[PDB]
Write a protein that binds this ligand. Structure first.
Ligand SMILES: Cc1cc2nc3c(=O)[nH]c(=O)nc-3n(C[C@H](O)[C@H](O)[C@H](O)COP(=O)(O)OP(=O)(O)OC[C@H]3O[C@@H](n4cnc5c(N)ncnc54)[C@H](O)[C@@H]3O)c2cc1C
Ligand SMILES: Cc1cc2nc3c(=O)[nH]c(=O)nc-3n(C[C@H](O)[C@H](O)[C@H](O)COP(=O)(O)OP(=O)(O)OC[C@H]3O[C@@H](n4cnc5c(N)ncnc54)[C@H](O)[C@@H]3O)c2cc1C
Ligand code: NA
Lengths: 335, 335
């Protein structure tokens, strides 16, 4: 059974790992990707576990997000959780209005509304939440997934796939399409578009909480947020639909710094370390489904797993579990 | 009006500040001087991680603690918060059995019980709390107070005071005794005793919460605790009555490290940065009262402000205000 996983981001590596630990013994797993850690969108993410506020169009995604939290919760107190870049963090979600509770309110730990004395610390906001969640930094998690894969016999190849057929010609029986925001290059998807994001990494070691603000009229993550990592603090708040510019933007740089300093004036004493741009694979819902390749002399099974938007880290494991369930359905039908 | 404050820890400097801001105008001149054998970072105040949390049990002590928190909380987003060494932090208080709520439950931010899913992360404990408090790092706060004092004309002097009388003979009208655990060298106090504590400073920046454990089998502050500072994380849990050893010892280092690693297994990847020993000024209650000096030819009143145990940072401001009131009493009896 010969399988090719395209994509070395959090989605491709976790799917390759998750499929391997369920369906090996003898599985031939190969990972094709043209960029690896540190040069993926997964490495640009702060890694805060938090799905979108509104309910997902696919209610299964709330299940996938809950399965990812429980899986990461089973790692947090293991002695090597820092090798995963995983740790607990509590923080604030700030609003100008009483947004309804999110679907993940019982998934995170200790979800509650903010008290007036807490809201008095943020004069520009009149409502919000407090809860405890997790951070999973891509740079560490992708490296962890890699050696978990390599020590299992999984081989990696740096190469740009031009088409599913080219891989099908080489004899792949299953193609796992985990190409993120670039899935349209292999199969047109007018529902897939980039959510361009720019972030800033600063040295602010006194920041122990995440702080996320929301103006839903401006769009999700078009409002300042502050997310402490393991080494530095991530400043952000830019979500640009349809923008493919990978270069850092000067107005976006000012927008991040302005907004975050207004939110947390202590950041005026912070040292800027770096600045990065990434593309969220935006889709009305995640494409997680099986598909027959209707092109070429062979019918090759494709498991799609892309379009995770701004919550790929948040949801990757449940999606990997679902893709593994589809792989098994293929393995049974092929007999 | 000559005043000599003995001690440059949090009690002496805050008392000297409170006395000046309250009686500077009505007394021209008000000559305040601070005598101290040692200054930050060589005071007991500098060994403390600086977490605000009073004892778990004199009912004025609850008020002085709450006054301190409200005064510190009003500075959280101020431009000087980094100069003060102040920042917010949430964390866990863990118990082996159910315990009633503390008196200060409404002073901190978002106090609540731990949920079953949270308590599952700490198998050694079946009950606990979660809330948001403050850390005031003495290494910064003592420098901040010193600067506020010097700009108000308060002069500092490095000297070991041998007796109250030596300072009285030099013309001091009021002596504020803020000598902490060493107050007994100036006047025998069989109620004051050293509470020796050894701590560990480690580089574990993924730790965003404090964790305090409570073990009646081991004693108060003799159970592991984890308190993240700005640059390092304090590992502690040592309370030894009557031990005057100022050196770190290996057995106490092991007790802390093993205890904290059992509580938080990720610490096995932390770099130990440093290790300090301090002596809590243990007393059944704070000595905060006036006394006429019955030694030497001079008419000098002593204001005692010592014996704050393991909560001096937590309570320092309320005590400083009360000491300023006692100073006002002395002024009223001089007329
Ligand atoms: C600024 C920003 C902040 C974010 N913060 C968070 C956060 O806090 N929490 C969260 O959960 N999510 C967050 N996200 C979202 C998260 O980054 C993504 O949802 C997630 O990384 C998507 O993973 P992926 O593997 O599908 O995409 P990618 O990580 O981009 O992986 C795509 C992979 O496919 C490969 N590939 C693509 N096309 C081809 C081809 N033709 N041939 C070969 N290889 C190919 C690429 O080389 C790459 O290895 C953030 C995103 C941005 C932009
Ligand atoms: C390990 C540890 C952890 C702690 N953690 C916390 C915590 O998280 N939160 C909290 O609120 N509290 C904490 N504490 C308690 C806190 O450190 C003390 O209660 C507080 O620092 C006492 O303040 P002080 O100014 O009286 O003593 P000090 O800070 O020791 O100041 C005494 C001063 O008097 C001077 N002095 C003494 N004798 C003389 C003399 N004869 N002549 C001249 N100068 C003299 C000294 O040189 C020094 O300047 C902790 C204590 C320890 C040991
Ligand atoms: Na438990």
């Amino acid at each position: 059974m010969r399988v090719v996983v395209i994509g070395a981001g959090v989605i491709g590596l976790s799917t390759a790992l998750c499929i391997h630990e369920r369906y090996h013994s003898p599985l031939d797993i190969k990972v094709y990707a043209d960029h690896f850690t540190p040069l993926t969108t997964t490495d640009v993410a702060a890694g805060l576990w938090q799905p979108y506020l509104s309910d997902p169009n696919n209610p299964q995604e709330a299940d996938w997000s809950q399965q990812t939290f429980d899986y990461l919760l089973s790692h947090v107190h293991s002695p090597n959780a820092e090798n995963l870049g995983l740790f607990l963090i509590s923080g604030y979600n700030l609003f100008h209005e009483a947004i309804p509770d999110p679907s993940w309110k019982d998934t995170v730990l200790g979800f509650r509304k903010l008290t007036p004395r807490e809201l008095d610390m943020f004069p520009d906001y009149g409502y919000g939440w407090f809860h405890t969640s997790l951070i999973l930094e891509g740079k560490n998690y992708l490296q962890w997934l890699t050696e978990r894969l390599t020590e299992r016999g999984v081989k990696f190849f740096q190469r740009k796939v031009e088409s599913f057929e080219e891989v099908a010609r080489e004899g792949a029986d299953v193609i796992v399409n985990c190409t993120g925001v670039w899935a349209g290059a292999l199969q047109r998807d007018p529902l897939l578009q980039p959510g361009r994001g720019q972030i800033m990494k600063v040295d602010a070691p006194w920041m122990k909480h995440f702080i996320l603000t929301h103006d839903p009229e401006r769009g999700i993550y078009n409002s300042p947020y502050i997310i402490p990592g393991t080494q530095t603090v991530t400043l952000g708040g830019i979500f640009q639909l349809g923008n493919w510019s990978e270069l850092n933007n000067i107005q976006d740089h000012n927008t991040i710094w302005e907004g975050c300093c207004r939110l947390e004036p202590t950041l005026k004493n912070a040292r800027i370390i770096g600045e990065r741009t990434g593309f969220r694979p935006v889709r009305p819902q995640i494409r997680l489904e099986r598909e027959q390749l209707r092109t070429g002399p062979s019918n090759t099974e494709v498991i799609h797993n892309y379009g995770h938007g701004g919550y790929g880290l948040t949801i990757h494991w449940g999606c990997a579990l679902e893709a593994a369930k589809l792989f098994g359905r293929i393995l049974e039908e092929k007999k």
